[PDB]
Design a protein around this ligand. Structure first.
Ligand SMILES: Cc1cc2nc3c(=O)[nH]c(=O)nc-3n(C[C@H](O)[C@H](O)[C@H](O)COP(=O)(O)OP(=O)(O)OC[C@H]3O[C@@H](n4cnc5c(N)ncnc54)[C@H](O)[C@@H]3O)c2cc1C
Length: 456
DNA sequence: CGGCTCGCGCA
DNA sequence: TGCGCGAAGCCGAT
C-alpha cells in the first residue's frame, strides 16, 4: 500500500473488502508510542494515499483487575503523555472502555472508518478480539508488526526448538529489516477523560494492593518513570554508562548493570528496533554488544515465536517430550518442602536468597534477570506438581512484574520450568532432567549476602 | 555427528 | 573470578 521507506512484509491483510471513504483508524494495543511505530507509520501512509486523516483508538479492558496498581499506573501515565504527543501531530486519540470485540466494531460503524489497522502480538486474547472484530466490520483490516525488528511470521514459519536454530534465521534477515524510522507526518485534515479512568481504576485495585505489616504499600514507584520520553532517557544512560560493562556484570544482581528497558519494551513505550539501531552504531565492548544484541533480538523475538506457534504457551503441554516424560516420572518423588501460593507470594520460604528475590519483585516490580531463574526453578522444586509450579510462577510474574503478561514471561517461565528452548541436564529428584540451580552456585558467581541484605 | 543462553574442581 | 569438564536429549546440516 504505497510507501518508499515502508517494507510491505511488515503488514499483512486480516480481512479483505472495499476501502471506505472514511479516515484510517489505528487500533493501538501493544505499541503505545508515537515515534518509531510501524503500525502508526503504516496507518499514516494509507491515510495519505486516500486523502483522509488518521485517528488512534485505545480500548481499556477489564484486564487491569487481574494485575495491580503498579502496572495500571505505569501504563496510564504513558497514555496521558501519548495523548499530548499525538495532539501535537494533529492526530486525535480516542480511548474506549469494555470488550474490544464489540467496542472497536461499534467504533468502526459510528465513526464511518475506511480502513482499520492494529499492531501485532501473539497473545491468545488478541487473536480472539481480532476475529470478533472481523465478523463485525466490512472494511479492510490490516495488522502490522511494530514490536519485532523482523516480522514474527517472516523470521520463522514454525516453533523454533532452540536459539541456535533461530539465531541464523534472524541474523540473515537483519540487513533487510534493520532500517531507520521515517518521521511521523502530522495530519492535514483534522476530524472520555484519562484522568477519570485512572481514578476509577485505582479505587477498584486498592483492596488488592500489596501491603506491609503496618499497612504500608510495598511497591516503590520512583524506580521507573513511565512514558515515551523517560524510556528514551533510559536507553541513553544504558548505552553511555552501562553498555560497556554489560557483558561482564550481566548476571550480578548486586550491580545495576542491566538496561532496565523491559517495562518500557512491554507496554510499547519504546521500540526495540530503535534500541538495536542505537546499540549498533555505538562504540563499546564487542562481547558486551554481542551479549546485549542476543538478548533483545534473538531471545525477545523467539518469545513471540513461541507464543505464536504454541497456543498453550502457558501450559504443561507446550513443554518438549523429553521434559514432560522426565517431570511425569518424578511426580511421586517426595519433596523437601511444600509451599502454597500465599507462602511464595509473601516470601516465607526457608531460602533467604529466594525471599530476597521476591522482595525485589514486590518492592520495585522488576526482579534481576539472573535471580528470576532461581526464583522460578525453586518454585518447581517446592511445589505439589509441575502444573502447580507453572500456575504459581505465572501468577506471581503476571501480578507483580512491571513487564508481566508478556511473551517474554511465558517463554522465560517455560524455559525455567519446562526446559523450553533448553536441553536436558543431570538426573535429579523432583525436577528430573530440568536445568538445576543451587544456592551454592550463586555464592560462587556474586555476593549473595549483599543481594539478601538489600531486600531484607 | 557437533553444539547447544547449569554445577563443580581447580589456579 | 575465569576456565575446562561433566551430564544429558535432540535438532539439522548432510
Ligand atoms: C521465569 C522468567 C520470567 C520472565 N518474565 C518476564 C516478563 O514477564 N516480562 C519480561 O519482559 N521479561 C521477562 N523475562 C525475561 C527477563 O527476566 C527480563 O526480560 C529482564 O530481566 C528485564 O530486565 P532488563 O530489561 O533490564 O534486562 P536486559 O539485560 O537489559 O535485557 C534487555 C531486553 O532483552 C530482553 N530479554 C532479556 N532477557 C530475556 C529473556 N531471558 N527472555 C526474553 N527476553 C529477554 C527484554 O526485552 C529486555 O528488556 C523472564 C525471564 C524468566 C527466566
Amino acid at each position: 500500500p504505497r510507501g518508499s521507506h515502508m517494507n510491505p512484509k511488515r503488514i499483512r491483510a486480516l480481512k479483505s473488502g472495499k476501502q471506505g471513504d472514511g479516515p484510517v483508524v489505528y487500533w493501538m494495543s501493544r505499541d503505545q508510542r508515537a515515534e518509531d511505530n510501524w503500525a502508526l507509520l503504516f496507518s499514516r501512509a494509507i491515510a495519505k494515499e486516500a486523502n483522509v486523516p488518521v485517528v488512534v483508538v485505545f480500548c481499556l479492558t477489564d484486564e487491569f483487575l487481574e494485575a495491580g496498581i503498579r502496572q495500571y499506573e505505569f501504563m496510564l501515565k504513558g497514555l496521558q503523555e501519548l495523548e499530548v504527543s499525538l495532539s501535537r501531530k494533529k492526530i486525535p486519540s480516542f480511548f474506549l472502555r469494555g470488550d474490544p470485540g464489540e467496542k472497536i466494531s461499534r467504533f468502526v460503524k459510528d465513526y464511518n472508518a475506511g480502513t482499520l489497522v492494529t499492531d501485532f502480538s501473539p497473545l491468545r486474547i488478541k487473536n480472539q478480539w481480532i476475529e470478533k472484530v472481523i465478523s463485525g466490520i466490512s472494511i479492510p483490516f490490516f495488522e502490522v508488526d511494530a514490536h519485532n525488528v523482523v516480522p514474527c511470521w517472516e523470521a520463522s514459519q514454525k516453533h523454533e526448538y532452540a536459539a541456535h536454530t533461530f539465531r541464523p534465521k534472524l541474523y540473515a534477515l537483519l540487513p533487510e529489516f534493520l532500517e531507520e524510522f521515517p518521521e511521523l507526518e502530522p495530519n492535514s485534515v483534522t476530524p472520555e477523560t484519562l484522568s477519570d479512568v485512572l481514578e476509577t481504576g485505582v479505587k477498584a485495585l486498592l483492596p488488592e494492593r500489596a501491603l506491609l505489616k503496618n499497612k504500608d504499600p510495598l511497591f516503590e514507584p520512583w524506580h521507573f518513570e513511565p512514558g515515551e520520553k523517560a524510556a528514551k532517557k533510559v536507553m541513553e544512560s544504558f548505552i553511555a554508562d552501562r553498555l560497556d560493562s554489560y557483558g561482564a556484570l550481566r548476571n550480578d544482581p548486586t550491580k545495576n548493570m542491566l538496561s532496565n528497558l523491559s517495562p518500557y519494551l512491554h507496554f510499547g513505550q519504546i521500540s526495540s528496533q530503535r534500541v538495536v539501531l542505537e546499540v549498533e552504531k555505538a562504540e563499546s565492548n564487542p562481547g558486551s554488544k554481542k551479549a546485549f544484541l542476543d538478548e533483545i533480538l534473538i531471545w525477545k523475538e523467539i518469545s513471540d515465536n513461541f507464543c505464536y506457534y504454541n497456543p498453550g504457551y502457558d501450559g504443561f503441554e507446550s513443554f518438549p517430550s523429553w521434559a514432560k516424560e522426565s517431570l511425569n516420572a518424578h511426580r511421586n518423588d517426595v519433596r523437601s518442602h511444600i509451599y502454597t501460593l500465599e507462602e511464595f507470594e509473601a516470601g516465607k520460604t526457608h531460602d533467604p536468597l529466594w525471599n530476597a528475590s521476591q522482595m525485589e519483585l514486590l518492592s520495585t516490580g522488576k526482579m534481576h534477570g539472573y535471580t528470576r531463574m532461581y526464583w522460578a526453578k525453586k518454585i518447581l522444586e517446592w511445589s505439589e506438581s509441575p502444573e502447580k509450579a507453572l500456575e504459581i510462577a505465572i501468577c506471581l510474574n503476571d501480578r507483580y512484574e512491571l513487564d508481566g503478561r508478556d511473551p517474554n514471561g511465558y517463554a522465560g517461565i517455560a524455559w525455567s520450568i519446562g526446559g523450553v528452548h533448553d536441553r536436558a541436564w543431570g538426573e535429579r529428584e523432583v525436577t528430573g532432567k530440568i536445568r538445576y540451580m543451587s544456592y551454592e552456585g550463586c555464592k560462587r558467581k556474586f555476593d549473595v549476602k549483599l543481594y539478601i541484605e538489600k531486600y531484607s
